[PDB]
Design a protein around this ligand. Structure first.
Ligand SMILES: *[C@H](C)C1/C(=C/c2[nH]c(/C=C3N=C(/C=C4\NC(=O)C(CC)=C4C)C(C)=C\3CCC(=O)O)c(CCC(=O)O)c2C)NC(=O)C1C
Ligand SMILES: *[C@H](C)C1/C(=C/c2[nH]c(/C=C3N=C(/C=C4\NC(=O)C(CC)=C4C)C(C)=C\3CCC(=O)O)c(CCC(=O)O)c2C)NC(=O)C1C
Ligand SMILES: *[C@H](C)C1/C(=C/c2[nH]c(/C=C3N=C(/C=C4\NC(=O)C(CC)=C4C)C(C)=C\3CCC(=O)O)c(CCC(=O)O)c2C)NC(=O)C1C
Ligand SMILES: *[C@H](C)[C@H]1/C(=C/c2[nH]c(/C=C3N=C(/C=C4\NC(=O)C(CC)=C4C)C(C)=C\3CCC(=O)O)c(CCC(=O)O)c2C)NC(=O)[C@@H]1C
Ligand SMILES: *[C@H](C)[C@H]1/C(=C/c2[nH]c(/C=C3N=C(/C=C4\NC(=O)C(CC)=C4C)C(C)=C\3CCC(=O)O)c(CCC(=O)O)c2C)NC(=O)[C@@H]1C
Ligand SMILES: *[C@H](C)[C@H]1/C(=C/c2[nH]c(/C=C3N=C(/C=C4\NC(=O)C(CC)=C4C)C(C)=C\3CCC(=O)O)c(CCC(=O)O)c2C)NC(=O)[C@@H]1C
Ligand SMILES: *[C@H](C)[C@H]1/C(=C/c2[nH]c(/C=C3N=C(/C=C4\NC(=O)C(CC)=C4C)C(C)=C\3CCC(=O)O)c(CCC(=O)O)c2C)NC(=O)[C@@H]1C
Ligand SMILES: *[C@H](C)[C@H]1/C(=C/c2[nH]c(/C=C3N=C(/C=C4\NC(=O)C(CC)=C4C)C(C)=C\3CCC(=O)O)c(CCC(=O)O)c2C)NC(=O)[C@@H]1C
Ligand SMILES: *[C@H](C)[C@H]1/C(=C/c2[nH]c(/C=C3N=C(/C=C4\NC(=O)C(CC)=C4C)C(C)=C\3CCC(=O)O)c(CCC(=O)O)c2C)NC(=O)[C@@H]1C
Lengths: 162, 172, 172, 162, 172, 162
C-alpha cells in the first residue's frame, strides 16, 4: 500500500537507482510528522467504537428513510443497526491506520478501491456514510497536530464518496 | 509493497482491531531511532559503488576458479552481471532498512532467485559469500564513528545484518 | 467456440458422416423449443443485476465469517470482486442456454478457475454456495408464469439448472 | 466455429456485456430460418454420396487432361477416381454441416482455412472443384427455402476457390 | 546460435586454451569440403517444395487413417500445417548442413516439439516417418551425379542423413 | 555468436525462407578467406603466450603509474603482473577465435559485451589495454593474408576500448 516510505521506494526502484536528494527529504518529512499520526491512532484506539455508536444514531435523525423502510435490505431491523456501527467502525479503523502510515494507503485499498461499484450494487447511498463521517469530525474533540492528521484522512474519505 | 508501519496495519486489519498500546509504542520506537536509520540509508547509498566493488574483489580471491575459464562467471558480460546482481541485493537491502520491512527485497528481488541461478548454472553458495562480504563491508561504513553525532545504533546494525543474511539464505 | 448445432457437426465430421435421422430430429427439437429458450435468455439478462445482488446477500448471511475481517473477502475491492465473479458465472450460464452447448462457459470462464481460487486463498465451497443460490434465484425468475404465454419449459429449467451445477462442481 | 449464435456470443463477450437488442434479433432470426437448413442437410444425408459419384464423372468430361495424365499424381488410375469422389463427398458433407449451423463456419475451418496453400502445394487445380460443384448446384432438384440454404453455401465454396 | 567453427571455440574457451593442432586441422577439413557442402545446401533449397510435397504423398500412402476423418490431420488447415511443419524441419536441416553444427535445428525448432505434438494430439511416429521419407528423397537429389563435377561427398551424405535422424528421434 | 555463417542463417530465419542469392555468396566468401584465418589462429596458438608476456612488460615502461602504486588494486605486486599477462592472454586468445570464426563474434560476447561497465567498476583504464595491444600488432611479424586477418580483429578490440 501507499505510504510516503513506499511511494519513494517505488519511484526509486522504477528508475533503478537509490533515493534521490528530493525523495530522502520527503522521507525525513514523514518522521518529523509521524508522532502526531501515532497519537491520532491512539485516540481512535481508545474511543473509536464509542464515536461509531453515536454516528449510527445521527443518521437515523438526519435521514428518516433508513429506519422506516423494509426488512430484507434496510436499517429498520436491530440487525441493520449492528451493521451500521460495524461499517462506520470499519471506516474509523481504516482512518486510524492512515495516521499510523502517514498516507492515504489504507483508505485506498481497504475502502476506495471498488467503492462506487459496491454501493451501486447493494443499494447503499454514500449520503449516509458522508453524514456520519461529518459527525465524528466535529465531535471528536482533538487538539491540533493530532487533529490535523485526523481531519486530513476523514476528509479524504468524504472526498472519495462524494 | 509494505513498510514497518503498514505491516502491523495489515495484521491489525486481519483481526479487525485498532492498533494496541504495545503496537503504537513499538512503532513510536522506530520514529525515535529514525534519524539513525536514515544515516544508515545514506551511508550505504553513498558507498554503494565501493561496497559492491570490494566484495567482488574479495570473492574472486576466495574463489578464483569461478571467475577464470571454465567457471560460471567468465567473460566481460558475466563479470558485469555479477557486480550488477550484487548491486541489486545492496540496493534492496537499503530499501529494507528504510521501509523497516523486508517485503521489497522479498517481492521484487529474492522471489525466484534460487530458481534463476539453478537454471543459469550460477552457484549460489558463491553469491551468498558475496552477500556476506557486502555485509562486513557495509557494517564498517554504516557504523563509522567519524562524521556523525556519537550514539548507539546497535538495533540498526543487527537489523541491517539480518537483511543481508536473509538475502544469502535465499540463494544458498 | 461451439453451439448445440456445431457440437453434433464436430462429432459428425470425426466419423466422416452426414448427420443421421436422429441427429437432425434432436436438433429440430431445439428449434421447436427455441422461443422458450430465448425467453430464458431474456429473463436472466433483464434480472442480471438482481440475481447476483441477492445471491450475495444470502451468501453473507450463510457465511458471515468469510466477509468480515480475517475472512478471504474483506475490503471493498474484494466485495466488488466477489459480485463481479458471480456476475461472470451468470453471464456465461446465459451464453450456455443460448448456445445450447456449454463450451463457452467451459473454455473462457471455468478453465483454470479452481486453480485461480487456490492460488488466491478464495474458498471454493463458498463460491459454489453462491452459484447454488443464483440457481434458485434464476429458476424463480426464468419460470415465472406471469407475463408469458403459458406452457411447458421443463427441459429448459433442467438444462439451466445443470449449467449452474457444472459451474459449481468446477470450483468446489 | 462461426455460427450466428456463436458470432453474437463472441461479440457480446468482447464487450463484457449480455446480448444487445440488435444481437438478440439476429439470433431470433437464426431460428426462424433454421428448419429449412436442417431439411437441407436431410437431402444431403440421403443423396449426397450419389451426387458426388456423378460430379466426379462430370469433370472427366469437362476437363480431359485429368484422366489421360500420369500415375503418381493424377486421376488416370481407378484409385484417383476414389479420391475424387471422396474429396467431393467431403465438400458436400461440409456444406450440409453449414445448413445445420446456419453459417459459413464449417466451410471456414474445414475447407477455406488453408485452401490455397494446400492446392498450390499438391498440384491441385481449383478449376476441377468449381466444375464439379457447379454441377450438383444445377442437378440437386431442390424446392425453394431448402434450395436457398443449399445454394448459399455451395456458392460460398465456389467464391472461396476462385 | 553456433556454427562448426564456433562450437570448437566455445569448447576451447571453456578450458582457456587456444585451438590445438588437431582442432585447426579438423576445421581446415571442413573448408576443404566446403564446395561440396554448399552444393548440398543449394540442392535441398532448390528442391525444397518438391522434397516436402512428395514425402507427404508417401506418408498419406503409408498411413491413410491419419489424414482422412477421425485422424489427427483431417481438414485443409491441418493438411497445410503438416506440409508447413515438414518444410520447417527441412529448412532447419539445410541450416545445419551450412553451419556444420546442429544448434540452429535444436534451439529454435526441435526444443519443445515433442511437447507441442503431445499437447496437440499429433502422433510423432508419423512425423518421424515423414522426416525419414524426406531423408530418402533428400539423399537422391543431394547426391545426384548429374550436373556436377564428379567426386566424393560421402561424409556430407552421412552428416546430412544424421541431421534428419536427429529431427526424427526428437518427435518419436 | 556472430559468424558470417550464423549472420546469414539468422537473417534467413527471420524472413522464414532459405538463403538468398546474396546471402549464399556471402557464405561462399567466408570459405575463400577461411584458410588464412585458421593459419592466423595457428600463429597465435604457438606464440600467443610469448607475445602476452612481452606486452605486459611494455605497459610498465609506457605508463609508469601502474608499477609504483598501491597493493590492494594495482600492478605493483608480482601477483598483479600475473593477472596482466592473464588478461592480455585472454584478449589474444579471443582474437585467435575470431580468425577461426571469420567474424567479430568471439570479441563481441567474450570481451565487448559489458566492457565499459566492468572497467569503470574495477578502476581499470582501457589506456593500458590499448597500449599492450598496439605492441603485439607491430611485433607479431606475420606475412600478409594471415596478417590481414590478425590485424582486423586486433584493431576491432582497440576500436571497442577507445
Ligand atoms: C450504516 C451507515 C447503515 C447500514 C449499512 C449497511 N451496509 C450493508 C451492506 C454491507 N456493508 C459492508 C461493509 C463493508 N465491507 C467491507 O469490506 C467494507 C470496507 C472496509 C465495508 C464498509 C458489507 C460487507 C455489506 C454486505 C454484507 C452484509 O450484509 O453485511 C448492509 C446490509 C443490507 C443489505 O443487504 O443491503 C447494511 C444494513 N444500512 C443503512 O441503511 C445505514 C444508514
Ligand atoms: C477430384 C476433384 C479429383 C482428384 C482429387 C485428388 N486430390 C488429391 C489430394 C488430396 N486431397 C485431399 C482431400 C482433403 N483433405 C482434407 O482435409 C480436405 C478438406 C475437407 C480435402 C478436400 C487430401 C487429404 C489429399 C492428399 C492425400 C491423398 O493422397 O489423398 C489427390 C491425390 C493425388 C496427389 O497425391 O496429388 C487426388 C487424386 N484428382 C483429380 O485430378 C480430380 C479432378
Ligand atoms: C594488465 C593490462 C594490467 C593488470 C590487469 C588487472 N585486471 C584486474 C581485474 C580483472 N581483470 C579480469 C579479466 C577478465 N575477466 C574476463 O572475463 C575478461 C574478458 C575475457 C577479462 C579480461 C578479471 C576477471 C578481473 C577481476 C578479478 C581479478 O582480480 O582477477 C586486476 C586485479 C586488480 C583489482 O582487483 O582491481 C588486475 C591487476 N593491472 C594493471 O594495472 C595492468 C596494466
Ligand atoms: C555474482 C555474485 C555471481 C553471478 C551472477 C550472475 N547473474 C546473472 C544474470 C541474471 N541475474 C538475475 C537476477 C536479477 N535480475 C534482475 O533484474 C533482478 C532484480 C529483480 C534480479 C535479482 C537474472 C534475472 C539474470 C538473467 C538475465 C540477465 O542476463 O541479466 C548471470 C549470467 C548467467 C550466465 O551464465 O549467462 C550471472 C553469472 N555469477 C557468478 O558466478 C557469481 C556467483
Ligand atoms: C548509527 C548509524 C551511528 C550514529 C547515528 C546518529 N544519528 C543521529 C541523529 C541525526 N542524523 C541526522 C542526519 C540526517 N539524516 C537524514 O536523512 C538527513 C537529511 C539529508 C539528515 C540531515 C540528523 C539531522 C540527526 C539529528 C541531529 C544530529 O545530527 O545530532 C544521532 C544522534 C541521536 C539522535 O537520534 O538524535 C546519532 C547518534 N551514532 C553512532 O554512534 C553510529 C555511528
Ligand atoms: C465471491 C463469490 C467469492 C470471491 C471471489 C474473488 N474473486 C477474486 C479475483 C479474481 N477472480 C477471477 C476470475 C475471473 N476473472 C475473469 O476475468 C474471469 C472471466 C474469464 C474469471 C472467471 C480472477 C482471474 C481473479 C484475479 C484477478 C482480479 O483481481 O480480478 C478475488 C480476489 C482475491 C484476493 O484476495 O485478492 C475474490 C475474493 N471471494 C470470496 O470470498 C467469495 C467466495
Ligand atoms: C418457459 C420459460 C416459460 C414459457 C415460455 C413460452 N414462450 C413461448 C413463445 C414465444 N416467446 C417469444 C418471445 C420472444 N423471445 C425473443 O427472443 C423475442 C425477441 C425480442 C421475443 C418476442 C415469442 C415471440 C413466442 C411465440 C409467440 C408467443 O408469445 O406465444 C411460448 C408459447 C409456446 C411456443 O413455443 O410457441 C411459451 C409457453 N411458458 C411457460 O409456462 C414458462 C414460464
Ligand atoms: C505433419 C507431418 C504432421 C502433423 C503436423 C501438425 N502441426 C500442427 C501445428 C503446429 N506445429 C508446430 C511446430 C512449429 N511451429 C513453428 O513455428 C515451428 C518453428 C519454430 C515449429 C517447429 C506448432 C507450434 C503448431 C501449433 C501452432 C499452429 O497451429 O501453427 C498441427 C495442428 C494440430 C491441430 O490438430 O490443430 C498439425 C496437425 N499432423 C500430422 O498428423 C502429421 C503427422
Ligand atoms: C557431392 C554433393 C556431389 C559432388 C560435389 C562437388 N562440388 C565440387 C566443387 C564445387 N562446387 C561449386 C559450386 C558452387 N557452390 C556454391 O555455393 C556456389 C555459389 C553459387 C557455387 C558456384 C564450385 C564453384 C566448386 C569448385 C569448382 C567445380 O565446380 O569443380 C566438386 C569438385 C571437388 C572440389 O571440392 O573442388 C565436387 C566433386 N560430387 C559428387 O560426386 C556429388 C554428387
Amino acid at each position: 500500500m501507499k505510504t510516503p516510505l513506499t511511494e519513494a521506494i517505488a519511484a526509486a526502484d522504477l528508475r533503478g537507482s537509490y533515493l534521490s536528494n528530493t525523495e530522502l527529504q520527503a522521507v525525513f518529512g514523514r518522521f518529523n510528522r509521524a508522532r502526531a499520526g501515532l497519537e491520532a491512532a491512539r485516540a481512535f484506539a481508545n474511543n473509536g467504537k464509542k464515536w461509531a455508536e453515536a454516528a449510527a444514531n445521527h443518521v437515523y435523525q438526519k435521514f428518516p428513510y433508513t429506519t422506516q423502510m423494509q426488512g430484507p435490505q434496510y436499517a429498520s431491523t436491530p440487525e441493520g443497526k449492528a451493521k451500521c456501527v460495524r461499517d462506520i467502525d470499519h471506516y474509523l479503523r481504516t482512518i486510524s491506520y492512515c495516521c499510523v502510515v502517514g498516507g492515504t494507503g489504507p483508505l485506498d485499498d481497504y475502502v476506495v478501491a471498488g467503492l462506487k461499484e459496491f454501493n451501486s450494487a447493494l443499494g447503499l447511498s454514500p449520503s449516509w456514510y458522508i453524514a456520519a463521517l461529518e459527525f465524528v469530525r466535529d465531535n471528536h474533540g482533538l487538539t491540533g497536530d493530532v487533529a490535523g492528521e485526523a481531519n486530513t484522512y476523514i476528509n479524504y474519505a468524504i472526498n472519495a464518496l462524494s | 509493497m509494505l513498510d514497518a508501519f503498514s505491516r502491523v496495519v495489515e495484521q491489525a486489519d486481519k483481526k479487525g482491531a485498532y492498533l494496541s498500546n504495545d503496537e503504537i509504542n513499538a512503532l513510536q520506537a522506530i520514529v525515535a531511532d529514525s534519524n539513525k536509520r536514515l544515516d544508515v540509508v545514506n551511508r550505504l547509498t553513498s558507498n554503494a559503488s565501493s561496497i559492491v566493488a570490494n566484495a567482488y574483489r574479495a570473492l574472486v580471491a576466495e574463489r578464483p576458479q569461478v571467475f577464470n575459464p571454465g567457471g560460471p562467471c567468465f567473460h566481460h558480460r558475466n563479470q558485469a552481471a555479477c557486480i550488477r546482481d550484487l548491486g541489486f541485493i545492496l540496493r534492496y537491502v537499503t530499501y529494507s532498512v528504510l521501509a523497516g520491512d523486508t517485503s521489497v527485497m522479498d517481492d521484487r528481488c529474492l522471489n525466484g532467485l534460487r530458481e534463476t541461478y539453478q537454471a543459469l548454472g550460477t552457484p549460489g553458495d558463491a553469491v551468498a559469500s558475496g552477500i556476506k562480504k557486502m555485509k562486513e563491508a557495509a557494517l564498517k561504513i554504516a557504523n563509522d564513528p567519524n562524521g556523525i553525532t556519537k550514539g548507539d545504533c546497535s538495533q540498526l546494525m543487527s537489523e541491517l545484518a539480518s537483511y543481508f543474511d536473509r538475502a544469502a539464505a535465499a540463494v544458498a
